Structure 1
Amino acid sequence: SLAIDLEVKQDVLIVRLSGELDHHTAEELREQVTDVLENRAIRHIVLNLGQLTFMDSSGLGVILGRYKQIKNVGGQMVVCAVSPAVKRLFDMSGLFKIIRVEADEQFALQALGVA
């Protein structure tokens, strides 16, 4: 229900999600991501949501849990290729104010100077 493809480019962790993100699938994501943040010098996180077909507040929670981590190292959280539905959750929750939204992974990486 949720495929996770990770990749590191310098101090940026690229998280590519495919499928649906809810409380049921969020756990495997949290574990996988926090593992990377522990055994690597990551300052930023690019969340590629182009292949994500669904997300609820649990998706916002896992993102927000990471945001706190990234904020601790002075880095930035970037989400890209966001669906209108997911964009609706970011506006309504004000997350659009603390997390940058970009068109796609390339522009997101460019914004972080790693492309």
Structure 2
Amino acid sequence: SLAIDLEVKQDVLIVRLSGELDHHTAEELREQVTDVLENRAIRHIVLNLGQLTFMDSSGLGVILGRYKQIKNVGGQMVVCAVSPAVKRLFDMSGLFKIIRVEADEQFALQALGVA
């Protein structure tokens, strides 16, 4: 139901998501990212929700979870290619005053000064 594509460029970690990001699948996302930050020096995260056909509160949390992880090392989290549905859950909570939403992976990496 949820596939994950990871990639580390410079000190950024790009996480691309395909499918339904919910309670069940939100855990593998956590294991891997937390696992990855545990293994590499990551200052920033770019979450590409481009192929996300479903997100619930069990998804905001995995985001905010990482959000606080990156905040601790003075970096940022930028989300990109966010659907209308997912974008609505960002307004509901009030995360629209928390991370940086850009339009695609390139403008996300651009917002991070990525070469």
TM-score tier after normalising by the smaller chain length? over 0.9
- Measured after TM superposition, the shift of residue 9 of structure 1 is 0.6
Aligned ranges 1:79-94 → 2 under 5 Å: 79-94=79-94
Q: Distance in 2 between matches of 1:67 and 1:49?
A: 15
Percent same amino acid at aligned positions? 100
- Measured after TM superposition, the shift of residue 96 of structure 1 is 1.2
Aligned residues: 115
TM-score (ref. length: structure 1)? 0.98
Q: Distance in 2 between matches of 1:40 and 1:114?
A: 17
Q: Distance in 1 between matches of 2:100 and 2:111?
A: 10
- Measured after TM superposition, the shift of residue 74 of structure 1 is 0.4
Aligned to 1:49: 49
SS at match of 2:26: helix
Provide, for residues 5-48 of structure 1, a one-character-per-residue CA deviation record: whole Å limited to 9, x for no partner. Answer: 00011110000000000001001000000111011010000000
Q: Distance in 2 between matches of 1:106 and 1:18?
A: 18
The structure 1 segments of at least 4 consecutive aligned residues displaced by more than 3 Å after TM superposition are: none
Q: Let me know the Cα RMSD of the aligned residues.
A: 0.6
Unaligned runs of 5+ in 2: none
SS at match of 2:25: helix
Aligned to 1:15: 15
Q: Distance in 2 between matches of 1:7 and 1:83?
A: 22
TM-score (ref. length: structure 2)? 0.98
